[PDB]
Amino acid sequence: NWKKQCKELVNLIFQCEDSEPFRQPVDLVEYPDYRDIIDTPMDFGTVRETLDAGNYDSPLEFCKDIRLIFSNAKAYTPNKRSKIYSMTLRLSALFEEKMKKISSDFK
């Protein structure tokens, strides 16, 4: 059951300290130029909601949206000295480790 596996992984991510800036959509009052840089916003709350609505056709679609969270974060704050950049690298690494098993069990 890939859907329950992906749900467990999203719940795991919400418990990770590094996910805090990615739990909700980026706020456009706080970051007014965000959408001049980012075409397709994404966050873990949205991913959770999409999964619960049954609106991912496969784990690859789920993964693509999670990868988008990280690519967006790195695009908007590209300075590798920044806290957010390091939090993105660490959380990305954990996610990819976990997603590997889900993707195998599927294929």
Domain with 79 in it: 1-107
How far is it, in rounded angstroms, from Cα 39 to Cα 84?
19
Resolved by: X-ray
How far is it, in rounded angstroms, from Cα 48 to Cα 26?
16
How many structural domains is the chain composed of? 1
CA 23, 61, 38, 53 dihedral sign is negative
User: Of 40, 30, 31, 85, which Cα lies nearest the Cα of 66?
Assistant: 40
Final resolution, Å: 1.7
CATH of residue 58: 1.20.920.10
How many C-beta atoms lie closer than 10 Å to residue 72's C-beta?
Answer: 21
User: Of 5, 76, 57, 55, which Cα lies nearest the Cα of 13?
Assistant: 5
